[PDB]
Amino acid sequence: RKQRIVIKISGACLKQNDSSIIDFIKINDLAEQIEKISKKYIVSIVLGGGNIWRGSIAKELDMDRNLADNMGMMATIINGLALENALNHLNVNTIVLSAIKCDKLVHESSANNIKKAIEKEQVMIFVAGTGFPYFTTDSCAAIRAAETESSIILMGKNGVDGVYDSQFYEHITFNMALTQNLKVMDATALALCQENNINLLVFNIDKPNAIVDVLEKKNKYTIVSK
Amino acid sequence: MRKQRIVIKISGACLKQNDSSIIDFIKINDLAEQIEKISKKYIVSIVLGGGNIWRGSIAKELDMDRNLADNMGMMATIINGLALENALNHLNVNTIVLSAIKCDKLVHESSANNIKKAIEKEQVMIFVAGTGFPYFTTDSCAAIRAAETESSIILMGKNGVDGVYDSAQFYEHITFNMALTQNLKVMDATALALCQENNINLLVFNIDKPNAIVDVLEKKNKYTIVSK
Amino acid sequence: KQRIVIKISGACLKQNDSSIIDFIKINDLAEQIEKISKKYIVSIVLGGGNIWRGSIAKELDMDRNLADNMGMMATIINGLALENALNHLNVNTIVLSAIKCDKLVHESSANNIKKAIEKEQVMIFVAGTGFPYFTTDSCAAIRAAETESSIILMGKNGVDGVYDSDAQFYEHITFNMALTQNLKVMDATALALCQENNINLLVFNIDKPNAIVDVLEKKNKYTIVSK
Amino acid sequence: MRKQRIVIKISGACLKQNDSSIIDFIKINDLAEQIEKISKKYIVSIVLGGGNIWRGSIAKELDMDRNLADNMGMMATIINGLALENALNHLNVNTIVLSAIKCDKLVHESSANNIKKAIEKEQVMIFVAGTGFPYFTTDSCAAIRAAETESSIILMGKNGVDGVYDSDPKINPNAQFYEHITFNMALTQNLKVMDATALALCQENNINLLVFNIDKPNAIVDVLEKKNKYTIVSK
Amino acid sequence: PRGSHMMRKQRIVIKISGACLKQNDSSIIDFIKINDLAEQIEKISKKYIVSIVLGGGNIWRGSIAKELDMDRNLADNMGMMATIINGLALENALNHLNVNTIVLSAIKCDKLVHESSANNIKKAIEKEQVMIFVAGTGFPYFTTDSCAAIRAAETESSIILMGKNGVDGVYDPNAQFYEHITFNMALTQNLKVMDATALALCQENNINLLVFNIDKPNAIVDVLEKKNKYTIVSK
Amino acid sequence: RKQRIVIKISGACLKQNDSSIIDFIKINDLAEQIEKISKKYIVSIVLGGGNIWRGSIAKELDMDRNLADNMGMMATIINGLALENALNHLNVNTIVLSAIKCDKLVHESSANNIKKAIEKEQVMIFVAGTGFPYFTTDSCAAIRAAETESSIILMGKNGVDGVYDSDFYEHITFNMALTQNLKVMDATALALCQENNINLLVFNIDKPNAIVDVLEKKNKYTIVSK
């Protein structure tokens, strides 16, 4: 009866200040929530690398997009190993699955390994995106959702309670989103979610117990469905 | 001389004549002949489908979940990729098969480095096994490869159809916005989004016709441009 | 628990040219393997004739190194299809490939075979030896010796066993009489491999319903090849 | 030319200006410009640290065991390695990233063959991910890479300090500055120019140190021309 | 020593040089010697988490490298291959005694051996497998002793059993026996217990040595029970 | 393709006595011959490991066949790197191609890598057999000959001039060797050679300049064909 979910966790969720790329209280709070959630759900985590690497630094370094996205993928691996460590301390059975092969550090994602991880009911930490440039964290979240047969992506926003207009939305269609010219995710991720019937649960991730609370429908959130 | 970069999307059906053989030698050789000529003026990336070997309908019959079904399709593209490479080798075209899935005994792996290296050598790049991920179409892979190689245009070969219609009125030029508004199925929504985000144009034409790929680059027949 | 190799040619998985793999045929195969796996340690060696043949290689002017590579990718496709069919029957199974391709299959090795035997998984051997100039029969012989299987089930498509030529049915023949009589049970390489390592053949008609189960219970017409 | 072989140890701090960005483009481009000029006279091996991205203090905060902590550090050096390669490619320097950990989609693997091949081609070798093993420092890896490439000297760039002193200069306005010191004198005084393991590796294989201030403009080029204040550690 | 129990076992590294596996020149590996070793490891593995670090001297030595005009990078590579051969032989011997065992290699070679990594070591310890460490560090300029130190630190083993071929422990004919020496006392007395690098690594990570005669029957079992003549090296 | 040859070099060719697994004078003499030969031929070398590992030691160690053949494969890699070193000192362009992947030591054999090595006209040193148990050095020699499109295998014997009936045939047929019951190669290697029209050139390899001489038809040798 365990239903499957993808939690999109951007890099900003792991960082407090510029002094440290990863903040221990923020990542441990995250781990604590995942611990509780993993009792009722099969959990897939899709991480960003914005705390370590951003598009702005790529421009400063005159870095072409192929290489820039590669840097981002490495950043997600660092975050992935940090989250795994935090979850291991809580005795949560967890596995880091990477789109890029690097056996000394992480396991490789594949149809077999995902299936294997689901049977063991491991928390799946997905890293290095798709192993391809020109993908966003959101697009990877879409692909991972379809791949793991998760019908919903929890889309944590940093500061924002859900879909607004920079009036709140309790619920919104994908159609009504694109007619209203709202940038909930990039166009590619939107298309991916629509094609494979994946819903979004947009909420404020900065709030204490945010992820636990929105699965209990406790706070302000937006659902983006067909 | 001086070469601009193009992606040619070649579906599985372009390589197959009838059900007796998954790959037809005349069709693949004709394709290789055209690529030979084109590679003198362009840096050529080929993105192959596997429809001649593997289809979505067979996956249903075998009660095959999507993760596995798309993996079968990826292996199909590798077979096609090696066949095309062989045909191009016979014409002394410098060529390399770059795979999204690692398989050293058969193919080279696609990567930032290997693509860059193949471009410098001006090799025809045969891209194979899609993105290595399920839930992607050949069109989406074409978009990703175009962005990755900095190709501004994808030649979208259609089997039988001259371009973009509405069923029967012919368009010479349409916008991506104009496309999905008229509920036209040029590519899947994901591929469309990818092309728009990265300013990649489509050149839709009939690929079944003799010398079709060569002729559309010389603007000689009926075709449709899709831009922003 | 006795160890066996079942040689399954590509034609066993195909009905007609419209589809490379037929769901009824592969499901029937899986059903039989399911039952057999309760009494035997099962190794499956697959061909790729349903997808790729020697005749297409000639048409494409394809040299042998590449042609055999095409065939090996064909067996992987078949291997993943059969694994899927067996998974739906809750049979513990693993695809072991002679060619490394981690995103799709596991690699065959001394360790992984040993590990698969301990777990009593059905072993689906794929991509031959990873080398050109090998037949499916030769791979079956190597896999038999490697798994310490004393017998290869040699499924033929249409033929009840070994005859004079196709009519006298042989109940039992020797590999020595499988060249002396000018017959062609397997290629010479596979024959030598089997003799070298004391591997016997059980030649039977695999097209018949329940054929694999029946021959292990000695129920139908079959030929023993030994000595 | 008959190029002599050198290892340049570049810590993470050399690539970072402030906390807003892990890698600063001016600092890394300045480094690349110097390596460009140096590579005309020398076969250059670069050994990078990852302190701009990852440090030991973060590992403690995250309650991270040492095996995992050092793995984070190795991934950090790969990021730095790819950024430096990019900077050098823009200056048309033939360069290769050689990693102690296999990761084909991003880097080449270091091996006896690949090093030999890179030396013949006279590429700048950017060594990355240390030894692929925990319990090694950047210094230790620099020693190993020096021995492996048959480099007789390691340029040991320090951030702010001009070289080896008998004590911290920031405190004592009376600290001796050594233009040359032996490993022997340095250990009886208990100076820790490098960690004990790196020191032992250098002594075992007759590798010398050239300690200097890396923050100064043109520092690496100048020290090879013997132009500024530097400490040679030898014997 | 360490003297542990059946649950929550202490972790040890046993350094087994190539000479322990060879009787004479007619065969590189002697079945009696390797089976005796396996028998001891079987008994020891009941009370300890056991890591074995093997040398390759029975197959390859430094002297052959000189004869073949072989540079160090390649020479050490030959040695690493030798340890893999030894590793597979010991694993076979241990498998016949039904000891759960795994060969972990610093060099990737999937058809022969498993790769060592933080994850695989952790996984092997959980399963309480005997870990046979092979191919050193995958790098040249390391001795078997230095690999033993690195493996000890990596596995969090507090002690390395240093089997010597012929000698009961540490001495200065009729020499004086040391029951205990410091690492300081080790170098300061010119006593070559291990190479300088291995010594440094052990000091840095607080790893002790247990030096004993490995040629004697039941030697490894007996020194863990404190039964014979042996030397502790420690801080 | 025709002017390509396979030279089968057993382990015994590299060893003088038990004190050293590899003898420098024997291996250097072999290297000198290969140097001269590689000017006129595309050379594939198939090495055995009998100088380091043999079947008799496997029995003593109670070693199952799968593991025993694995030991032998690692032995050939050691020999392969030794021969490469000897050829490098003579400035011969050479590459070690292994049936088993081990990137830190050797390159992997494949259709692409063989093709690439042939175009470069490198001496190919084939190592680790087929990567499979139940193969002999002779069988590997057959497979490499067919793979490289070599029409002939130089079958160096240690002590014997050619094909007798033990202590002389100048030309034997394959079928004749079977009727006569001669042990030229194991049955599998014989079948492989016949299937792919590969000839054998059996000669005494212990003799000075033996390999060079037999290609110039200079000494006593047996030619095997069908």
Curated annotation (Swiss-Prot), chain A:
Q: Which InterPro entries match?
A: AceGlu_kinase-like_sf, Asp/Glu/Uridylate_kinase, Uridylate_kinase, Uridylate_kinase_bac
Question: What's the effect of swapping residue 132 to N/A?
Answer: Still no activation by GTP. Exhibits negative cooperativity with UMP. Marked decrease in activity
- Catalysed transformations (reactions): UMP + ATP = UDP + ADP
**Protein family:** Belongs to the UMP kinase family.
HAMAP family per the UniProt record, alphabetical? PyrH_B
- Report the PANTHER family cross-referenced here: URIDYLATE KINASE, URIDYLATE KINASE PUMPKIN, CHLOROPLASTIC
Per the entry, what this protein does is:
Catalyzes the reversible phosphorylation of UMP to UDP, with ATP as the most efficient phosphate donor. Is also able to phosphorylate dUMP.
Q: What is this protein called?
A: Uridylate kinase
Organism annotation: Ureaplasma parvum serovar 3 (strain ATCC 700970)
* Gene name, Swiss-Prot/TrEMBL: pyrH
Curated annotation (Swiss-Prot), chain D:
- What keywords tag this UniProt record? ATP-binding, Cytoplasm, Kinase, Nucleotide-binding, Pyrimidine biosynthesis, Transferase
Give the SUPFAM superfamilies listed for this entry.
Answer: Carbamate kinase-like
- The name this protein carries in UniProt is Uridylate kinase
Taken from the UniProt entry, a GO cellular component term is: cytoplasm
Q: How does activity depend on pH?
A: Optimum pH is 6.8.
Q: Organism's domain of life?
A: Bacteria
Q: Where in the cell is it found?
A: Cytoplasm
What residues does UMP bind to? 50, 70, 131-138
Q: MF terms per GO, please?
A: ATP binding; UMP kinase activity
In short, the EC number is: 2.7.4.22
Look up the record and give one Gene Ontology term from the biological process aspect. Answer: UDP biosynthetic process
Which family does the similarity line name? Belongs to the UMP kinase family.
Report the catalytic activity: UMP + ATP = UDP + ADP
Subunit note: Homohexamer; trimer of dimers.
- Binding-site residues, ATP: 9-12, 51, 55, 159, 165, 168
What InterPro entries does the database record attribute to this sequence? AceGlu_kinase-like_sf, Asp/Glu/Uridylate_kinase, Uridylate_kinase, Uridylate_kinase_bac
Pathway assignment: Pyrimidine metabolism; CTP biosynthesis via de novo pathway; UDP from UMP (UMPK route): step 1/1
Q: Which Pfam families match?
A: AA_kinase (PF00696)
Q: What is its main location?
A: cytoplasm
Record entry for activity regulation: Unlike other bacteria, is not activated by GTP. UTP is a competitive inhibitor against UMP and a non-competitive inhibitor toward ATP.
